[PDB]
Amino acid sequence: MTEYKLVVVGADGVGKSALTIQLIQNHFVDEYDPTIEDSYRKQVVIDGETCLLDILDTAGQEEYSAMRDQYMRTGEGFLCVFAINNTKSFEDIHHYREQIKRVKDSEDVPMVLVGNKCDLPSRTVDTKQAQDLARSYGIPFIETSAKTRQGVDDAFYTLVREIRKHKE
Ligand SMILES: Cc1cccc2cccc(N3CCc4c(nc(OC[C@@H]5CCCN5C)nc4N4CCNC[C@H]4C)C3)c12
Ligand SMILES: Nc1nc2c(ncn2[C@@H]2O[C@H](COP(=O)(O)OP(=O)(O)O)[C@@H](O)[C@H]2O)c(=O)[nH]1
Ligand SMILES: [Mg+2]
């Protein structure tokens, strides 16, 4: 089977952990320790390919040490997550994409832009705004809810698909 190393990044509170746990463990966590960073592995079939997904759920403090830089650059693809009711988290996307380009030392890194919490009633980030940002980057965009599980499998599988085509 093919191993894929995925890294879920984005501002605190956007739902990186809920998204990962929903995909790995099939349940919605409401109060996952905001500081716990860990890797999770899941065997799954994507487009008929058996895949082992190694998924780094990032957390902790905004540090830029050489060890963290090294942990991140093992990512083959990146889920860049913001929440549709958190303007600041959307604005922060550019920064995360810049940090990815830096530690990977490349301007084409497989990435998917993810607008989480789409179950929530009053969003301040419009679908169009985020699509526009995605198309500027050349990356896919998907809306997700870690609560209802909408889009969750597709967000991760779509990232896997972006890694395949980068590998040609
Ligand atoms: C994420 C990432 C990807 C690829 C390579 C990296 C290399 C080094 C460090 C990384 N990370 C570490 C965690 C982190 C990072 N950048 C911000 O930016 C917060 C705000 C907004 C813009 C500037 N800054 C002021 N915040 C963070 N953390 C806030 C507190 N909890 C967890 C975490 C989300 C950057 C790399
Ligand atoms: N309503 C709703 N709440 C969510 C969703 N995803 C995460 N949350 C909640 O938002 C908070 C932060 O989620 P968490 O996964 O810890 O964010 P992280 O800092 O990105 O890991 C928690 O209270 C979650 O229960 C979602 O899709 N919808
Ligand atoms: Mg978390």
Side-chain angles (χ1 to χ4, degrees), residues 21-51:
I21 287 149
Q22 191 55 271
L23 184 90
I24 303 301
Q25 299 174 5
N26 303 295
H27 64 104
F28 176 52
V29 172
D30 208 334
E31 207 257 305
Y32 203 72
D33 192 318
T35 75
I36 293 286
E37 192 169 85
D38 206 17
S39 271
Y40 306 80
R41 309 179 113 241
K42 173 72 164 308
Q43 199 155 17
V44 71
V45 185
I46 301 158
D47 305 319
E49 181 181 54
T50 302
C51 311

Short mmCIF file of all heavy atoms in Angstrom, two decimals, residues 21-51:
data_model
loop_
_atom_site.label_atom_id
_atom_site.label_comp_id
_atom_site.label_asym_id
_atom_site.label_seq_id
_atom_site.Cartn_x
_atom_site.Cartn_y
_atom_site.Cartn_z
N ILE A 21 -9.71 13.57 13.99
CA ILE A 21 -10.34 12.53 14.79
C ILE A 21 -11.59 12.01 14.09
O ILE A 21 -11.88 10.81 14.12
CB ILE A 21 -10.64 13.07 16.20
CG1 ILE A 21 -9.34 13.20 17.00
CG2 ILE A 21 -11.62 12.17 16.93
CD1 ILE A 21 -9.39 14.31 18.00
N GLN A 22 -12.33 12.89 13.43
CA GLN A 22 -13.48 12.44 12.65
C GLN A 22 -13.04 11.45 11.57
O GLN A 22 -13.68 10.42 11.35
CB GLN A 22 -14.21 13.65 12.06
CG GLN A 22 -15.57 13.37 11.42
CD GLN A 22 -16.56 12.66 12.35
OE1 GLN A 22 -16.60 11.44 12.39
NE2 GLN A 22 -17.37 13.43 13.06
N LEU A 23 -11.92 11.73 10.90
CA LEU A 23 -11.48 10.84 9.82
C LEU A 23 -10.90 9.54 10.37
O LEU A 23 -11.23 8.45 9.89
CB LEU A 23 -10.47 11.54 8.94
CG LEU A 23 -10.03 10.72 7.73
CD1 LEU A 23 -10.91 10.98 6.52
CD2 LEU A 23 -8.60 11.07 7.42
N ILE A 24 -10.03 9.64 11.38
CA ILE A 24 -9.41 8.46 11.96
C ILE A 24 -10.43 7.64 12.75
O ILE A 24 -10.60 6.44 12.49
CB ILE A 24 -8.22 8.86 12.86
CG1 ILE A 24 -7.19 9.68 12.07
CG2 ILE A 24 -7.60 7.63 13.52
CD1 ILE A 24 -6.60 8.97 10.89
N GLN A 25 -11.12 8.26 13.71
CA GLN A 25 -11.91 7.54 14.71
C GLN A 25 -13.42 7.64 14.53
O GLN A 25 -14.16 7.04 15.32
CB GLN A 25 -11.54 8.02 16.12
CG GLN A 25 -10.07 7.77 16.47
CD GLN A 25 -9.63 8.36 17.80
OE1 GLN A 25 -10.43 8.89 18.57
NE2 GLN A 25 -8.33 8.26 18.07
N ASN A 26 -13.90 8.37 13.52
CA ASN A 26 -15.33 8.43 13.20
C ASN A 26 -16.20 9.00 14.33
O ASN A 26 -17.35 8.61 14.50
CB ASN A 26 -15.86 7.05 12.79
CG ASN A 26 -15.10 6.48 11.63
OD1 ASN A 26 -15.15 7.02 10.52
ND2 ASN A 26 -14.39 5.39 11.86
N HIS A 27 -15.69 9.94 15.11
CA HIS A 27 -16.57 10.63 16.04
C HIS A 27 -16.14 12.09 16.18
O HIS A 27 -15.00 12.46 15.89
CB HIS A 27 -16.62 9.92 17.40
CG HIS A 27 -15.32 9.92 18.13
ND1 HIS A 27 -15.06 10.75 19.20
CD2 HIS A 27 -14.20 9.18 17.95
CE1 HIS A 27 -13.84 10.53 19.64
NE2 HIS A 27 -13.29 9.59 18.90
N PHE A 28 -17.08 12.92 16.62
CA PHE A 28 -16.86 14.34 16.78
C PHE A 28 -16.45 14.62 18.22
O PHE A 28 -17.24 14.40 19.15
CB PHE A 28 -18.13 15.12 16.41
CG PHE A 28 -18.02 16.62 16.63
CD1 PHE A 28 -16.96 17.34 16.09
CD2 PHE A 28 -18.98 17.30 17.36
CE1 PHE A 28 -16.85 18.71 16.28
CE2 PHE A 28 -18.89 18.67 17.56
CZ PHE A 28 -17.82 19.38 17.01
N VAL A 29 -15.23 15.12 18.40
CA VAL A 29 -14.77 15.55 19.72
C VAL A 29 -15.06 17.04 19.88
O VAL A 29 -14.81 17.84 18.97
CB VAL A 29 -13.28 15.24 19.92
CG1 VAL A 29 -12.76 15.89 21.22
CG2 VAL A 29 -13.05 13.74 19.94
N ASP A 30 -15.59 17.41 21.05
CA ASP A 30 -15.97 18.78 21.38
C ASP A 30 -14.89 19.55 22.13
O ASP A 30 -14.89 20.78 22.08
CB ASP A 30 -17.24 18.77 22.24
CG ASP A 30 -18.07 20.03 22.08
OD1 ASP A 30 -17.51 21.09 21.72
OD2 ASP A 30 -19.30 19.96 22.31
N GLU A 31 -13.99 18.87 22.82
CA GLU A 31 -13.03 19.57 23.67
C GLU A 31 -11.70 18.83 23.65
O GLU A 31 -11.16 18.41 24.68
CB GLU A 31 -13.60 19.73 25.08
CG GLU A 31 -13.05 20.94 25.82
CD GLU A 31 -12.00 20.56 26.85
OE1 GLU A 31 -12.31 19.71 27.72
OE2 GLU A 31 -10.87 21.11 26.79
N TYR A 32 -11.14 18.65 22.46
CA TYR A 32 -9.81 18.08 22.34
C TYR A 32 -8.76 19.09 22.79
O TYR A 32 -8.76 20.24 22.33
CB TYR A 32 -9.55 17.66 20.90
CG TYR A 32 -8.49 16.61 20.77
CD1 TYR A 32 -8.74 15.30 21.17
CD2 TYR A 32 -7.23 16.91 20.27
CE1 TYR A 32 -7.77 14.33 21.06
CE2 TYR A 32 -6.26 15.94 20.15
CZ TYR A 32 -6.54 14.65 20.54
OH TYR A 32 -5.58 13.67 20.44
N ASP A 33 -7.86 18.66 23.70
CA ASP A 33 -6.76 19.48 24.22
C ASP A 33 -6.15 20.31 23.09
O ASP A 33 -5.52 19.76 22.17
CB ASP A 33 -5.70 18.59 24.87
CG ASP A 33 -4.67 19.37 25.69
OD1 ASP A 33 -4.20 20.44 25.26
OD2 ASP A 33 -4.30 18.88 26.79
N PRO A 34 -6.32 21.63 23.12
CA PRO A 34 -5.82 22.48 22.02
C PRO A 34 -4.32 22.46 21.85
O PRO A 34 -3.84 23.03 20.86
CB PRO A 34 -6.31 23.88 22.41
CG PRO A 34 -7.45 23.65 23.35
CD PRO A 34 -7.10 22.40 24.10
N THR A 35 -3.56 21.83 22.74
CA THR A 35 -2.11 21.90 22.70
C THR A 35 -1.48 20.58 22.32
O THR A 35 -0.25 20.51 22.19
CB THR A 35 -1.54 22.36 24.05
OG1 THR A 35 -1.61 21.28 24.99
CG2 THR A 35 -2.30 23.59 24.59
N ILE A 36 -2.27 19.53 22.16
CA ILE A 36 -1.74 18.21 21.90
C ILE A 36 -1.54 18.04 20.40
O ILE A 36 -2.50 18.09 19.62
CB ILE A 36 -2.66 17.12 22.45
CG1 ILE A 36 -2.66 17.20 23.98
CG2 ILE A 36 -2.16 15.79 22.01
CD1 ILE A 36 -1.38 16.68 24.60
N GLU A 37 -0.29 17.85 20.02
CA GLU A 37 0.11 17.57 18.65
C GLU A 37 0.43 16.08 18.54
O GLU A 37 1.16 15.54 19.37
CB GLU A 37 1.32 18.42 18.27
CG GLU A 37 1.66 18.46 16.80
CD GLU A 37 2.68 19.52 16.49
OE1 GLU A 37 3.89 19.23 16.63
OE2 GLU A 37 2.30 20.66 16.12
N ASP A 38 -0.10 15.42 17.52
CA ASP A 38 0.20 14.01 17.35
C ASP A 38 -0.03 13.61 15.90
O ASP A 38 -0.71 14.30 15.14
CB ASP A 38 -0.66 13.15 18.27
CG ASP A 38 0.00 11.83 18.60
OD1 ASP A 38 1.23 11.71 18.39
OD2 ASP A 38 -0.72 10.92 19.06
N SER A 39 0.54 12.46 15.55
CA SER A 39 0.31 11.80 14.27
C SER A 39 -0.68 10.65 14.43
O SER A 39 -0.65 9.93 15.44
CB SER A 39 1.63 11.27 13.70
OG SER A 39 2.28 12.25 12.91
N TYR A 40 -1.56 10.48 13.44
CA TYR A 40 -2.52 9.39 13.42
C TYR A 40 -2.43 8.67 12.09
O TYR A 40 -2.23 9.31 11.05
CB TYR A 40 -3.95 9.88 13.65
CG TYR A 40 -4.10 10.70 14.91
CD1 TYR A 40 -3.72 12.04 14.92
CD2 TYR A 40 -4.61 10.15 16.08
CE1 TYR A 40 -3.84 12.80 16.05
CE2 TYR A 40 -4.73 10.91 17.23
CZ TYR A 40 -4.35 12.24 17.20
OH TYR A 40 -4.46 13.03 18.32
N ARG A 41 -2.57 7.35 12.11
CA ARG A 41 -2.45 6.55 10.91
C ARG A 41 -3.76 5.83 10.64
O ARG A 41 -4.45 5.39 11.57
CB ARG A 41 -1.28 5.56 11.01
CG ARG A 41 -0.01 6.29 11.43
CD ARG A 41 1.20 5.39 11.58
NE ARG A 41 2.21 5.70 10.55
CZ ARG A 41 2.63 4.84 9.63
NH1 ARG A 41 2.14 3.60 9.62
NH2 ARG A 41 3.54 5.21 8.73
N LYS A 42 -4.14 5.79 9.37
CA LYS A 42 -5.38 5.15 8.96
C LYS A 42 -5.17 4.48 7.62
O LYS A 42 -4.71 5.13 6.66
CB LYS A 42 -6.53 6.16 8.87
CG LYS A 42 -7.82 5.60 8.28
CD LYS A 42 -8.50 4.65 9.26
CE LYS A 42 -9.96 4.38 8.86
NZ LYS A 42 -10.71 5.66 8.64
N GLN A 43 -5.49 3.19 7.56
CA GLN A 43 -5.55 2.46 6.30
C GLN A 43 -6.89 2.74 5.63
O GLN A 43 -7.94 2.62 6.27
CB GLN A 43 -5.38 0.97 6.56
CG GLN A 43 -4.98 0.17 5.38
CD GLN A 43 -4.26 -1.10 5.78
OE1 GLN A 43 -4.34 -1.54 6.93
NE2 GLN A 43 -3.54 -1.70 4.84
N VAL A 44 -6.86 3.12 4.36
CA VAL A 44 -8.09 3.49 3.67
C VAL A 44 -7.89 3.29 2.17
O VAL A 44 -6.77 3.33 1.67
CB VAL A 44 -8.49 4.94 4.01
CG1 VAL A 44 -7.55 5.92 3.38
CG2 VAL A 44 -9.89 5.22 3.55
N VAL A 45 -8.98 3.06 1.46
CA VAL A 45 -8.96 2.85 0.02
C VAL A 45 -9.43 4.13 -0.64
O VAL A 45 -10.55 4.58 -0.40
CB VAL A 45 -9.85 1.67 -0.39
CG1 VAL A 45 -9.69 1.42 -1.88
CG2 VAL A 45 -9.48 0.44 0.40
N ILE A 46 -8.58 4.72 -1.47
CA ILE A 46 -8.90 5.96 -2.17
C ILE A 46 -8.74 5.69 -3.65
O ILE A 46 -7.64 5.36 -4.10
CB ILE A 46 -8.00 7.13 -1.73
CG1 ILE A 46 -8.13 7.41 -0.24
CG2 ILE A 46 -8.37 8.37 -2.48
CD1 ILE A 46 -6.93 8.15 0.35
N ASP A 47 -9.83 5.84 -4.41
CA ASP A 47 -9.80 5.61 -5.85
C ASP A 47 -9.28 4.21 -6.18
O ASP A 47 -8.57 4.02 -7.17
CB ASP A 47 -8.98 6.68 -6.56
CG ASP A 47 -9.47 8.09 -6.24
OD1 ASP A 47 -10.70 8.28 -6.19
OD2 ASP A 47 -8.63 8.99 -6.04
N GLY A 48 -9.62 3.24 -5.35
CA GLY A 48 -9.17 1.88 -5.53
C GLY A 48 -7.77 1.61 -5.02
O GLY A 48 -7.35 0.45 -5.03
N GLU A 49 -7.05 2.63 -4.56
CA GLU A 49 -5.71 2.44 -4.02
C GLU A 49 -5.80 2.26 -2.51
O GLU A 49 -6.42 3.07 -1.81
CB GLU A 49 -4.80 3.62 -4.36
CG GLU A 49 -3.34 3.49 -3.86
CD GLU A 49 -2.46 4.71 -4.21
OE1 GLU A 49 -2.85 5.86 -3.88
OE2 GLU A 49 -1.38 4.51 -4.79
N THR A 50 -5.20 1.19 -2.00
CA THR A 50 -5.02 1.07 -0.56
C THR A 50 -3.95 2.06 -0.12
O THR A 50 -2.82 2.03 -0.62
CB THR A 50 -4.65 -0.35 -0.16
OG1 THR A 50 -5.66 -1.26 -0.62
CG2 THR A 50 -4.54 -0.47 1.36
N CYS A 51 -4.32 2.95 0.79
CA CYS A 51 -3.44 3.99 1.30
C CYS A 51 -3.30 3.85 2.81
O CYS A 51 -4.25 3.49 3.51
CB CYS A 51 -3.98 5.39 0.96
SG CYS A 51 -4.46 5.62 -0.75
#
